[PDB]
Design a protein around this ligand. Structure first.
Ligand code: MGD
Ligand code: MGD
Ligand code: SF4
Ligand code: SF4
Ligand code: SF4
Ligand code: MO
Ligand code: ZN
Ligand code: ZN
Lengths: 79, 131, 568, 438, 264
């Protein structure tokens, strides 16, 4: 239930934070999908986090490790 | 000093051209040297200061910065565009692909000199610089 | 609108042998009688046939464009252009093999041909094929989507859903605007995507555990159930290796339990192509002889199997087949260029130059095999002429094939100029063979064979009433054949006239005009299956880079279609 | 608020077609664009502009630039194309495949030199394809099967942004359900690029020594790799052996290359040693080279002129009935160097910006015509600037992806009242030239 | 026995004078020779519009002999497919000199542009200038290229020397640059000066004598012996390297044959 922050100023729209998030990958890549909500979607060229109320993230670091030009900061402390 | 050099891409550069080749965004994105920190110290180049990149097939005054994409000691880099092609040598080796990456160049710290805009560079190379 | 007065007629579909009949084309379709306002053609002493139909030729597609790129030696060689220099038409003609689209169209027009069936097309790459077709000049043209390595047709023939697989074939055909079904190396081409090959008819595909036999049978059941015009055109397995006549018989025995049901006239149920490639014998290339005798004994037995020959024209060519393993094996044999184009969830590809020169025992026997096949045919209506252009030679060498058939002096000449004549005659049978196919037989297996097999003899391939007015007049007289076979070569190379739906397009062998062309497809009308709709949507979401709404060729990217409609 | 699906982004080789546009009520303003990268976002934002060129514009004696009618511009270009002796038409990177067919017809009528951005970009690669072949694949193949991925001399993060998230690394395919975590990504280039950040290996090679690197790899593959020196091209022998072992054990590999190979010493020999390496690896594994083509339809001129004249680029259409091709002799840059031209036509590119300035100086001695939708350097040093529609925004058509797969682009905005597209324009030029009876 | 050509009108662009060969000049009247076709741009000139002739050609090309005495330094295609005879260029030259030649000899007294001797099959060339790259190189997209004859570039060569060479010999009396004898299969290349490197890449078989200094040796060659060899000279005591181990090797009767590059 952590909080992710995306630096819009250096986001290129690469979409490798959307493809690599394992909560996004739940809908289409799971047998009998449990939850179909998504943290990121690239609207107007930058990654927007729809997870406003910080309910779905799991601090996995797959998205921080994925962005090619580090731009996603993961906060492990309560918002 | 011989300081081998390459010319490549960057997203800010692509973004800039699609804003427009005559835009302040394009100027800021392309007029850039991305060299090594060790080379900058050894040459005597202050970070974020104009510098004279002079190869055998031209010359250009370009801002000198340090790039995240770590160039090893002895490499330079200009984001491709007007400024880089002011200094790219035209040798093709009978293939039609000019020496766009890997030509020697000398670098001279020359602050207090302005940068030349894209229009000024091209229209003055041709002889059309009305302004 | 036009009448061709007083020319010998050869219409196998009407059983006409050398009659001085008159064809009165009227607005594109042949009609019995037209008034005296029609411009006439004095074809006296000239052999008239119908506008030839080609059933198997790769005159377009991504394979062919990959060949054209990869091979610029093809156009230019030793200082001079091997394609010849000519601008008869409004455009250029570049290329000896794999000619540019403007050369293929003009060369077929000069041949007399009018319909060409571009055999293999990956379904994903349909706009490419329809774009090259817009640029081919006069020939009407259809293309056959490849369904023998589609993953969707691996699932359905695994799980035994005839209705679902039929709905999928109808959807594909309606998307890629195809006209039939081609199985290229059943199953094996997909194992090539991992690097293996299906060397027989029984071995399973990796991860799918379906076999070539099962997939061929499933596609035959699908085809004859939907009643598509053309049958399951089949490539085969173990191509291009010695001893594979046994496997060719094994794959031909897969039709022994089906009957061609459709509203179009065709007696095939499957069409086994370039069989001189599948009719090898022996262990290796030093103990290698011809199995054409056995192959044609089986074909002469079975009446639901029709064939064509892949006669090699003994020259330099590039070989393009949709299967990878054969091309890779050929590259490892001859150490020349090799291009491979794997498609996503669908097929493979391979382009490799090859030299069919006269100075090799292997190439000599390969040349002899196709002649043995054609000269062992008791019924010629079932055995057609192609060259798998360009796999066995360019189409501009069709008249050479016809010369070889129609004059044994030509075959003696070639066998004598061949280097290892002793080995070739020892390991073949074509040295002592008298048969010279008659002009009626050649018209049969060039015009009526392909048309009737495609099940569109109503419009193409014959001069009977109501057919499409495509006529090709030749120089030679039917009463006495030429003494010098080069005369036959020239006579079939250059046509005295050629009409395309009523408009003369070739005169004396010189292009005259190019009105327009049609691109035939199949229009199966049937209620959709929710199951296949769902499976297709799922598979495009997970597996295909292109989108479902951008896979189907847009209604504006096809060039004068004229569908062939169906029911259920 | 009229959401339009399945649009095409017309900039990089990826030809991404998963773009969603929310066009305004009147169908002429783009409000929000989803699923596209920034470079693309900006293309659409520029296409939907309100203040854009609508009429041609001529250079008067005073040096300013005033508008003229389309028929007058067509007349000018036709008369000049006929009067010239060896005109050169360059560009075609950013146009539909009908735009590259109409141009072929126009220059067939004229008799000049027809050429595209292949010469200065991946033409050295084609020259290697001519030598060795092109063992390749479509991109869904690497999406659904690839176990090892090599980015030799390329930088997808900044060249093709959504390449990694669409085709190569992160997508979970069919046989690669585990996604990235079973893909081994190797990136080779002297810089430590963002692709190398995402990668798992990195072979920081001396710029220009890729031929020695490839030869080392191929000796390893051929088996007696013990004869390698201590280090090769700055890469250390044990790391060479590590990467080579991974490549050998790959179930299905794929190599991508770019300017690191096509713009350095030994332009085409780097590419053909790479292709030789791929053909050698297919002995024990499955490996497929693949070229990182730049513009959307830059593979479109290749295929269209392949089917028309048989030659992908550097076309010598001066004999008027047989064409010739020799990149060292018929290419735009070499002809500009040896002042072998008489007229330069800027169609779908920016020659002034992206050519060497000696070549631009040599070219400007002659008349100069630009057919672009918007202002750029060529349209600023040209003699007249003819506007034209933008592919994928104002006009649709076929385009050709990196791997020669045809995507069908859609139209989202109607072009400004008056502006035509290149196929209509080139056809009108050809009609007028035939009217002038040459 | 001889023909004399002298440039009278300078052509603003490059003239593709492929028609200037002993094969086309043999047994022709002076007016006919003056009206042989010649292209320029998209226009076709008559070859009397740019030259002035004074001589008598022979009944056979093996008899005739052309001498060009002007600034023919923007003329290309001289000697194309020349079967026998003689040509002299008393100046420099441009692209495709001697292309696809099958005999005779070309004595360019000056420089030369690229593609000199493309796919040559016999005969001689005697350049004394600085030939550019692709000297003796096979045409783009081919595998069997130069297969005989002699090329003698007495100056600085360039790239792509002897690409896909099959037989014959290319002698460069000066030095060279990258990519010598790539894709080759046979023949010799005798470079007598500094070479940047990349010599012998992709080689399947062949010989490459070098008397200068390789600055970038490819990893694919290993030293196996030190041999004395009389190549264009006398005993220079070469230390041969063996084969391009990177590329597959043709095998002969009971032995694998390597493409051995020599050195000083
Ligand atoms: N934003 C933006 N995107 C673009 C473009 C643009 O201009 N701006 N251009 C588009 C087009 S036209 C092109 S062709 C494509 C091509 O783009 P790419 O083919 O992907 O190549 P580059 O982006 O230039 O980066 C090439 C990498 O090779 C490295 N390199 C340089 N020299 C060497 C060498 O000698 N050896 C090795 N191993 N590596 C070397 C370079 O450091 C660089 O990391 O991008 C397209 N995408
Ligand atoms: N220093 C350096 N310079 C280089 C390179 C390098 O590596 N280093 N690489 C060179 C290479 S790889 C090339 S690709 C060039 C790339 O450079 P270019 O090929 O010139 O690419 P762009 O400048 O983006 O050209 C885009 C122009 O085409 C217009 N356009 C868009 N769509 C259409 C259309 O449908 N029809 C028409 N008529 N016009 C349209 C666009 O508005 C724009 O004006 O860069 C080259 N220059
Ligand atoms: S930390 Fe994990 S769960 Fe959270 S947004 Fe990133 S990838 Fe998704
Ligand atoms: S991965 Fe990084 S650069 Fe790409 S969209 Fe996400 S935050 Fe932006
Ligand atoms: S990767 Fe290229 S094609 Fe795809 S969205 Fe970005 S700019 Fe457009
Ligand atoms: Mo490019
Ligand atoms: Zn086949
Ligand atoms: Zn075929």
């Amino acid at each position: 239930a952590f909080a992710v922050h995306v630096n819009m100023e250096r986001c290129t729209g690469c979409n490798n934070c959307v493809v690599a998030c394992p909560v996004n990958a739940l809908e289409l890549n799971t047998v009998n999908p449990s939850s179909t909500d998504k943290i990121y979607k690239v609207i107007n060229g930058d990654a927007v986090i729809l997870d406003v109320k910080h309910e779905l993230c799991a601090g996995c670091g797959i998205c921080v490790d994925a962005c090619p030009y580090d731009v996603i900061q993961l906060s492990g402390q309560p918002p | 000093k011989t300081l081998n050099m390459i010319t490549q891409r960057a997203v800010e550069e692509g973004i800039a051209m699609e804003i427009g080749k005559t835009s302040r965004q394009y100027f800021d994105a392309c007029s850039i040297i991305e060299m090594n920190e060790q080379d900058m110290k050894e040459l005597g180049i202050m970070k974020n200061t104009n510098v004279r990149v002079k190869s055998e097939s031209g010359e250009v005054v370009v801002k000198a910065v340090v790039g995240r994409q770590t160039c090893y000691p002895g490499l330079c880099h200009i984001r491709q565009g007007v400024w880089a092609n002011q200094v790219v040598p035209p040798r093709t080796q009978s293939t039609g692909a000019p020496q766009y990456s890997g030509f020697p160049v000398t670098v001279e710290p020359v602050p207090n000199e302005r940068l030349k805009t894209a229009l000024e560079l091209v229209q003055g190379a041709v002889g059309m610089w009305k302004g | 609108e036009l009448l061709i007065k007083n020319g010998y007629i050869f219409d196998p579909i009407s059983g006409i042998k050398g009659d001085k009949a008159d064809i009165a084309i009227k607005d594109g379709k042949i009609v019995d009688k037209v008034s005296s306002k029609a411009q006439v053609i004095d074809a006296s002493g000239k052999t008239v046939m119908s506008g030839g139909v080609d059933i198997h030729t790769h005159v377009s597609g991504p394979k062919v464009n990959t060949g054209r790129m990869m091979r610029p030696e093809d156009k230019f060689f030793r200082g001079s252009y091997r394609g010849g220099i000519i601008k008869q038409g409004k455009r250029m003609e570049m290329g000896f093999s794999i000619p540019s689209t403007y050369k293929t169209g003009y060369a077929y027009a000069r041949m007399g041909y009018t319909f060409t069936n571009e055999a293999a097309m990956p379904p994903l790459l349909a706009p490419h094929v329809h774009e090259e077709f817009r640029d081919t000049p006069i020939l009407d043209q259809a293309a056959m989507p490849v369904f023998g390595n589609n993953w969707f047709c691996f699932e359905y023939i695994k799980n035994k859903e005839l209705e679902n697989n039929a709905a999928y074939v109808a959807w594909l055909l309606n998307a890629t605007k195809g006209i039939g079904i081609k199985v290229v190396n059943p199953g094996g081409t997909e194992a090539w995507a991992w690097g293996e090959n299906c060397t027989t008819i029984n071995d399973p595909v990796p991860y799918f555990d379906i076999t070539p036999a099962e997939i061929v049978k499933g596609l035959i059941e699908t085809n004859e159930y939907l009643g598509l015009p053309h049958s399951v055109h089949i490539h085969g397995n173990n191509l291009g290796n010695p001893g594979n006549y046994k496997d060719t018989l094994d794959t031909l025995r897969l039709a022994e339990s089906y009957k061609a049901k459709n509203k179009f006239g065709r007696e095939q149920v499957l069409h086994n192509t370039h069989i001189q490639f599948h009719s090898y014998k022996g262990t290796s290339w030093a103990d290698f002889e011809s199995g054409a005798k056995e192959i044609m004994d089986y074909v002469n037995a079975n009446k639901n199997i029709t064939c064509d020959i892949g006669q090699v024209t003994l020259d330099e060519t590039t070989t393009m087949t949709a299967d990878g393993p054969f091309e890779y094996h050929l590259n490892q044999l001859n150490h020349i260029k090799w291009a491979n184009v794997d498609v996503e969830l669908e097929t493979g590809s391979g382009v490799v130059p090859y030299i069919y020169d006269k100075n090799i025992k292997v190439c000599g026997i390969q040349w002899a095999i196709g002649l043995e096949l054609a000269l062992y045919a008791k019924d010629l209506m079932r055995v057609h002429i192609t060259t798998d252009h360009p796999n066995a030679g360019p189409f501009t060498r069709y008249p050479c094939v016809i010369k070889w058939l129609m004059s044994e002096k030509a075959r003696k000449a070639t066998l004598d100029t061949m280097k290892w004549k002793d080995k070739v005659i020892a390991a073949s049978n074509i040295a002592s063979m008298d048969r010279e196919l008659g002009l009626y037989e050649i018209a049969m297996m060039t015009r009526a064979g392909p048309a009737k097999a495609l099940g569109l003899a109503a419009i193409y391939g014959s001069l009977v009433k109501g057919a499409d007015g495509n006529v090709a007049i030749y120089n030679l007289d039917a009463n006495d054949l030429p003494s010098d076979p080069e005369l036959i070569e020239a006579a079939f190379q250059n046509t005295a006239y050629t009409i395309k739906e009523g408009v003369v397009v070739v005169k004396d062998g010189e292009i005259i005009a190019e009105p327009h062309k049609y691109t035939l497809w199949t229009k199966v009308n049937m209620p959709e299956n929710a199951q296949v709709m769902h499976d297709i949507k799922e598979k495009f979401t997970k597996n295909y880079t292109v989108n479902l709404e951008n896979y189907a060729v847009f209604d504006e990217h096809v060039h004068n279609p004229r569908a062939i409609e169906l029911d259920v | 608020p009229k959401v339009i699906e399945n649009v095409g982004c017309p900039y990089c080789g990826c030809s991404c077609d998963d773009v969603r546009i929310t066009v305004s009520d009147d169908g002429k303003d783009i409000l929000e664009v989803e699923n596209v990268c920034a470079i693309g976002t900006e293309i659409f934002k520029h296409g939907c502009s309100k203040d854009r060129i609508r009429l041609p514009r001529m250079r008067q004696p005073d040096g300013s630039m005033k508008d003229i009618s389309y028929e007058e511009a067509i007349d000018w270009t036709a008369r000049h194309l006929l009067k010239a002796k060896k005109p050169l038409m360059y560009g075609f990177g950013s146009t539909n495949c009908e735009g590259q067919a109409a141009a072929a017809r126009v220059m067939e009528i004229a008799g000049g030199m027809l050429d595209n951005c292949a010469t200065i970009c991946h033409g050295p690669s084609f020259l290697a394809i001519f030598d060795n072949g092109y063992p390749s694949c479509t991109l869904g193949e690497v999406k659904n099967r690839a176990d090892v991925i090599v980015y030799w001399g390329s930088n997808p993060a900044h060249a093709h942004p959504r390449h990694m998230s669409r085709y190569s690394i992160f997508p979970r395919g069919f046989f690669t359900g585990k996604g990235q975590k079973k893909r081994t990504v190797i990136v080779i280039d002297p810089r430590f690029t963002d692709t190398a950040n995402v990668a798992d290996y990195h072979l920081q090679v001396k710029q220009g020594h890729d031929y020695e690197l490839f030869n080392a790899f191929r000796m390893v593959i051929h088996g007696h790799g013990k004869d390698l020196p201590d280090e090769v091209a700055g890469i250390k022998k044990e790391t060479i052996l590590e990467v080579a072992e991974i490549m050998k054990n790959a179930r299905f590999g794929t190599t991508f290359f770019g300017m690191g190979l096509t713009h350095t010493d030994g332009r085409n020999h780097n590419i053909d040693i790479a292709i030789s390496l791929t053909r050698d690896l297919n002995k024990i594994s499955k490996w497929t080279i693949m070229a990182m083509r730049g513009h959307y339809n830059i593979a479109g001129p290749g295929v269209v002129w392949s089917w028309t004249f048989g030659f992908p680029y550097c076309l010598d259409l001066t004999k008027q009935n047989h064409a010739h091709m020799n990149p060292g002799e018929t290419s735009s840059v070499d002809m500009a160097m040896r002042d072998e031209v008489d007229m330069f036509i800027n169609i779908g590119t920016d020659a002034a910006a992206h050519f060497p300035i000696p070549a631009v100086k040599q070219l400007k001695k002659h008349p100069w015509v630009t057919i672009d939708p918007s202002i750029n350097m060529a349209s600023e040093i040209s003699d007249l600037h003819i506007p034209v529609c933008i592919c994928g925004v104002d006009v649709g058509g076929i385009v050709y992806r990196m791997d020669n797969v045809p995507i069908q682009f859609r139209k989202v905005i109607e072009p400004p009242e008056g502006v035509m597209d290149d196929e209509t324009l080139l056809n009108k030029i050809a009609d007028r030239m035939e009217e002038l009876k040459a | 026995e001889t023909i004399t050509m002298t440039l009278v009108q300078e052509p603003e662009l490059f003239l593709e004078c492929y028609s200037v060969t002993p094969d086309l000049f043999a047994g022709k009247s002076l007016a006919e020779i003056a009206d042989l076709p010649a292209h320029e741009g998209k226009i076709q000139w008559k070859l009397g519009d740019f030259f002035k002739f004074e001589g008598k050609a022979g009944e056979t090309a093996a008899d005739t002999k052309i001498v060009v005495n002007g600034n023919v330094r923007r003329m290309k295609r001289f000697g194309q497919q020349m079967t026998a005879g003689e040509i002299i260029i008393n100046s420099d030259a441009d692209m495709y000199i001697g292309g696809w030649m099958k005999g005779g000899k070309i004595t360019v007294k000056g420089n030369a542009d690229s593609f000199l001797g493309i796919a040559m099959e016999g005969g001689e060339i005697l350049i004394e200038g600085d030939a550019q790259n692709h000297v003796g190189s096979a045409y783009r997209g081919d595998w069997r290229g130069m297969s005989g004859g002699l090329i003698r570039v007495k100056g600085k060569a360039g790239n792509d020397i002897g690409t896909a060479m099959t037989g014959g010999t290319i002698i460069i009396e000066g030095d060279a640059f990258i990519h010598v004898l790539t894709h080759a299969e046979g023949g010799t290349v005798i470079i007598k000066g500094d070479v940047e490197g990349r010599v012998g890449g992709q080689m399947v078989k062949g010989d490459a004598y070098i008397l200068g200094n390789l600055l970038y040796p490819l990893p694919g060659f290993k030293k196996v012996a030190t041999v004395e060899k009389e190549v264009d000279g006398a005993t220079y005591t070469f230390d041969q390297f063996i084969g391009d181990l990177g590329e597959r090797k043709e095998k002969k009767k009971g032995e694998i044959i390597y493409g051995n590059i020599f050195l000083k």
